[PDB]
Design a protein around this ligand. Structure first.
Ligand SMILES: [Mg+2]
Ligand SMILES: [Mg+2]
Ligand SMILES: [Mg+2]
Ligand SMILES: [Mg+2]
Ligand SMILES: [Mg+2]
Ligand SMILES: [Mg+2]
Ligand SMILES: [Mg+2]
Ligand SMILES: [Mg+2]
Ligand SMILES: [Mg+2]
Ligand SMILES: [Mg+2]
Ligand SMILES: [Mg+2]
Lengths: 50, 75, 136, 177, 116
RNA sequence: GCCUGGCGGCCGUAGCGCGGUGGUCCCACCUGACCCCAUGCCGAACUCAGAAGUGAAACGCCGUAGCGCCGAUGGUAGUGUGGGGUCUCCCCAUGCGAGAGUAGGGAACUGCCAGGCA
RNA sequence: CCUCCUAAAGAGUAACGGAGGAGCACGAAGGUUGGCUAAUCCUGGUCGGACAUCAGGAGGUUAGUGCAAUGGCAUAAGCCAGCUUGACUGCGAGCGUGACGGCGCGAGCAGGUGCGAAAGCAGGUCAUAGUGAUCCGGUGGUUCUGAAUGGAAGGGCCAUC
RNA sequence: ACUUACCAACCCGAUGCAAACUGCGAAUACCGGAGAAUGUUAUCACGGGAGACACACGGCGGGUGCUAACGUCCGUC
């Protein structure tokens, strides 16, 4: 509905991304979460929120 | 204004008393903990009770609330 | 004309009217009117029997009504086809079983009471019978 | 301070004997004193309450507890979450020390002191009086004011009846009309 | 409600140690004394216990009910436990925080060779 | 053997309530709070250091059927099968048989470990 | 599509039958550790009204659950705070539910993480609605394929629109 | 503030009603296990060929309708 689809992008240069959703009007900052990257096989900071 | 219904969920007991179940076997499909999980019974996210061990389904009432519990007794 | 002040739901299933009654003894008065038969008592019927009771007895004694028409009955109006939803509530009935005390009375002698109920009973669609209070 | 020891030394003796008790721990002993300010008007501006919180914190040693409304009551346009009050709970020393700072230093400063009630005793042995202007207590300066908000005090006890509840405060020089 | 409050505060961990079938080293604490039992998975039989309300270890304490008394009980019950052959237990704080006297008792049993 | 405490079984014939009762010990309140830790204020609670005081509160035990709870027998209702009728409801044969209620019971019982008086 | 009833005590079960909802929300309203326990009325108390806040008492969930209803919920699934990203990736014994497509539940394993002293819990939210097959394309990744050969185009595969 | 022929909840005692009420609760039916007799494997699985997917009345239990209809929609025989 309101909430919009985003991709969380790995900082490990792998190209691996997660996908999730965000409300942009509220919490307009960049969602940064530590997530498992399965190319280097470590937990890694992911960054994007569109 | 009164012509809608939901598809039926096929809940309830799937394995009755003394019935020999393998591990993983769903025992009850339920909305909430109408039955609680006992020995060798797991309670899943939808609150369905499933067997963790091969064995025999055992219904029992236990505790100060007289709650209904399900356990697997290894045969 | 008796009717529930409020109800949880507007329309009730037809249901069935099996079994013997509860409320089988005279409980508040000395005398009562007991049903022998089975069937619905509409609110208009209950008011008419009550009107005839209170006039056969003129400001004398006390009267109790033990039945309440709580069941809504529906009717499709004239020239409507079958279906297209359930009909609209037209009247309220009390389901009656054999044995149900329907009205009770004290403060008058028996003989006036036998006469009051006879007139009330003529208004009702169910066989009735006069009855008296019982000890233990 | 003193009224802890003067309780132990003196007030206990009076109550121990005039209630013909059989064990020392029966004697009603003050547990806590709660100073409360139903703020009310402050739902418009947050600042009205914080002026009242600092008001509470000058009277007593310790800092107060900005309450909430627990529920929604449209009769005064409030809701679950918006602050509608503030309070303090005084125990141990500050409790007693407050009790001297009130009975001997603020209780002597009423507009037409006609005495004090003995029916605001709660029916289970706890007294509460509530006053009408903040300045009566010493640490609120008469010139640093912005609005006149009273408060509510409640002396809670280990008592049972309002009878011995009176006996305790009556044996503390507490005013009773 | 201070009594009941602790028992309700202990239930989830206790009930969870039943389902895991793990012998749990229970701890009871009072302003005076401190206690410890190694209780079997049925919950209905002690294997090993130690406490400051004794004489075998209470003469060696300034005051029963301190972090050093706890250590004694903690070091005691682990030694008694390792004689009977009991090594892997689960700690049951029984609604007391894992902060001082209980942490002392549990930290000592660890050094004495109880696996938790 | 009796008292206390911890852990359980059992989950109200086990609970509430009322009246009485206990402090060697244990338990409770209790004393104090630099430090450990803590209060969205408060050493109230959590918590640590303690042991003057009390068994008042609590707790436990004992007692008392005001209540809750348990609860027959018998009958009643319903019902499977078969049969039948005056068939919107009933009856018969057989089998199963409640709920409510009545008499009545009932102030739990039991285990493991520990400690204390004897 | 979800909930209840109809529905005849397993499931399932129809009507232009009776009644209500959904087409979301949430980086916390999720995970974990630790802690707490309501509604309502009563008594008494400054502005206080019948109802704000405070204290006690009775009460015992008659509340609360991000949103319908149902079943659940105190070991709380309900309220609070601290730390955090398990709203992990690959798999998956075995069950369930479906004509099929499919949907659902899932211990346990590998890898890596968070919480916690530890046992352990965590593969989203108390659960059950919150959705759209295939085709055609788009984007990123992946030297799998590459119409003489080396490349490339396009295609495939993985992730997503 | 005094009263009031009107009204009056909560609580208590008594009297009933409920598809969407349940502090109780069957008979039946269903799942499973064991055992005997009994039955032309009556069971399941894979495969070859199908037809059929307008049903009807009766009994029982029900919705709907008027417990109207050789009416209508389910369940079961
Ligand atoms: Mg069903
Ligand atoms: Mg059935
Ligand atoms: Mg893992
Ligand atoms: Mg939900
Ligand atoms: Mg490509
Ligand atoms: Mg070419
Ligand atoms: Mg080429
Ligand atoms: Mg067709
Ligand atoms: Mg057809
Ligand atoms: Mg048909
Ligand atoms: Mg026909």
């Amino acid at each position: 509905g309101i909430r919009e689809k985003i991709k969380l992008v790995s900082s490990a240069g792998t190209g691996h991304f997660y996908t999730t959703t965000k409300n942009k009007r509220t919490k307009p900052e960049k969602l940064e979460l530590k997530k498992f990257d399965p190319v280097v096989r470590q937990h890694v900071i992911y960054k994007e929120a569109k | 204004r009164n012509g809608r219904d939901s598809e039926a969920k096929r809940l309830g007991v799937k394995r009755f008393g003394g019935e020999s179940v393998l591990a993983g076997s769903i025992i009850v499909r339920q909305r909430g903990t109408k039955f609680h999980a006992g020995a060798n019974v797991g309670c899943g996210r939808d609150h369905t009770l499933f067997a963790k061990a091969d064995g025999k389904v055992k219904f029992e009432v236990k505790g100060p609330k007289n709650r209904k519990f399900i356990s697997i007794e290894a045969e | 004309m008796l009717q529930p002040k409020r109800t949880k739901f507007r329309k009730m299933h037809k249901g069935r009217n099996r079994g013997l009654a509860q409320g089988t003894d005279v409980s508040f008065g000395s005398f009562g009117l007991k049903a022998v038969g089975r069937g619905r008592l509409t609110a208009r019927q209950i008011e008419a029997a009550r009107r005839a009771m209170t006039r056969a007895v003129k400001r004398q004694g006390k009267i109790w009504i033990r039945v309440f028409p709580d069941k809504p009955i529906t009717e499709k109006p004239l020239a409507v086809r079958m279906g297209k939803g359930k009909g609209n509530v037209e009247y309220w009935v009390a389901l009656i079983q054999p044995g149900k005390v329907l009205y009770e009375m004290d403060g008058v002698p028996e003989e006036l009471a036998r006469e009051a109920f006879k007139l009330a009973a003529a208004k009702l669609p169910i066989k009735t019978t006069f009855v008296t209070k019982t000890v233990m | 301070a003193k009224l802890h020891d003067y309780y132990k030394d003196e007030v206990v003796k009076k109550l121990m004997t005039e209630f013909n008790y059989n064990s020392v721990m029966q004697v009603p002993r003050v547990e806590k004193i709660t100073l409360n300010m139903g703020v009310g008007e402050a739902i418009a501006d947050k600042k009205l309450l914080d002026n009242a919180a600092a008001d509470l914190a000058a009277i007593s040693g310790q800092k107060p507890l900005i309450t909430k409304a627990r529920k929604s009551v449209a009769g005064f346009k409030i809701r679950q979450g918006y602050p509608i009050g503030c309070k303090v709970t005084l125990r141990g020393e500050r409790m007693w020390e407050f009790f001297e700072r009130l009975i001997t230093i603020a209780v002597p400063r009423i507009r037409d002191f006609r005495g004090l009630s003995a029916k605001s005793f709660d029916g289970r042995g706890n007294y509460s009086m509530g006053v009408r202007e903040q300045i009566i207590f010493p640490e609120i300066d008469y010139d640093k004011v912005d609005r006149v908000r009273g408060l509510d005090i409640t002396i809670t006890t280990t008592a049972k009846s309002d009878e011995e509840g009176r006996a305790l405060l009556a044996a503390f020089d507490f005013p009773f009309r | 409600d201070k009594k009941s409050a602790r028992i309700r505060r202990a239930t989830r961990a206790r009930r969870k140690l039943q389902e895991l079938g793990a012998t749990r080293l229970v701890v009871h604490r009072t302003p005076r004394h401190i206690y410890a039992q190694v209780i079997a998975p049925n919950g209905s039989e002690v294997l090993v216990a130690a406490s400051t309300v004794e004489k075998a270890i209470a003469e060696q304490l300034k005051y029963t009910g301190n972090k050093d008394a706890a250590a004694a009980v903690g070091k005691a019950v682990a030694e008694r436990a390792l004689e009977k052959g009991i090594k892997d237990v689960s700690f049951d704080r029984s609604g007391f925080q894992y902060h001082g006297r209980v942490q002392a008792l549990a930290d000592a049993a660890r050094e004495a060779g109880l696996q938790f």
